[PDB]
Ligand SMILES: Nc1ncnc2c1ncn2[C@@H]1O[C@H](COP(=O)(O)OP(=O)(O)O)[C@@H](O)[C@H]1O
Ligand SMILES: CN[C@@H]1[C@H](O)[C@H](NC)[C@H]2O[C@]3(O)[C@H](O[C@@H]2[C@H]1O)O[C@H](C)CC3(O)O
């Protein structure tokens with residue numbers, strides 16, 4: 624909600640030379656730095672992002688590399704009048720894209736054919752060669768204990784309190800009920816991290832967060848991998864962990880996993896790194912949701928979501944049960 628309709632309209636007119644007659648702010652949003660609007664002209668619809676991050680230029684750098692590489696399953700930004708993929712403004716950055724109406728994977732299942740196409744495209748991304756100038760700017764997999772420590776710092780905080788409101792209490796209670804599994808996730812991630820032999824030579828370009836929510840499933844063959852904010856250099860397992868990973872209660876049907884590899888190309892998958900990620904990723908979520916639900920912070924309009932998502936992870940056939948089900952790797 625930084626600017627208003629008629630304010631974005633002028634900014635798009637001045638910097639993009641586009642004549643928009645209607646623009647609406649969109650809900651959801653990543654949070655903090657991340658606003659999204661739908662702006663329409665007489666003939667087209669645009670999806671506008673007003674970012675406030677730092678890596679936006681290096682990430683645009685990655686889709687620029689992917690577009691050069693011939694990957695069509697990505698939404699290429701719209702050029703500013705200065706031939707740039709983004710317009711640097713006073714306090715924020717503008718990034719326009721054409722508007723894609725397809726629903727994400729949490730709502731639309733992929734057909735066997737689309738599953739093959741996703742495997743084919745992920746392989747393409749992984750096989751993509753990255754210029755050393757970009758590799759030096761991309762974060763690398765260093766198996767940081769950062770999130771495991773934060774979750775542990777929670778261990779000794781889940782105790783009855785009078786200052787906590789209903790939400791905080793319900794969270795501590797839920798935490799206590801699943802304390803065993805929570806420690807197991809942290810311990811298994813820590814354990815597996817030491818069992819892994821870091822071989823920088825086997826690191827490929829990874830999306831790092833390619834679950835169903837980051838896939839727009841259009842008609843057919845018109846699917847799109849979005850959310851290119853965390854690309855990194857790491858083992859391919861960083862991304863393969865999602866196939867059959869169960870994020871969002873989908874992508875948890877074993878028979879689709881084969882459809883996927885049909886296009887990715889059945890190859891050797893390190894079952895240990897693949898298991899590490901499935902555990903570590905949940906540890907990260909526990910840590911992020913945990914901090915939000917404990918800080919108490921009033922401006923936390925997110926606590927509601929954080930709690931819902933937190934518990935969502937422990938549901939039947941969701942990410943926790945799938946990570947624990949080693950026989951699925
Ligand atoms: N080009 C686009 N056109 C239409 N909707 C889009 C477009 N890009 C993203 N979206 C919508 O926004 C949602 C979140 O996008 P994403 O890039 O993952 O942002 P965030 O990192 O905040 O989750 C997607 O589920 C989709 O509904
Ligand atoms: C910054 N990336 C996002 C964060 O990691 C976020 N957790 C703080 C993730 O939450 C999720 O893992 C998944 O993907 C979300 C990620 O895309 O998004 C779902 C809506 C909720 C989830 O629990 O299923």
Ligand SMILES: [Mg+2]
Pocket residue numbers: 836837850
């Ligand atoms: Mg997303």
Ligand code: NI
Pocket residue numbers: 690699
């Ligand atoms: Ni193109």
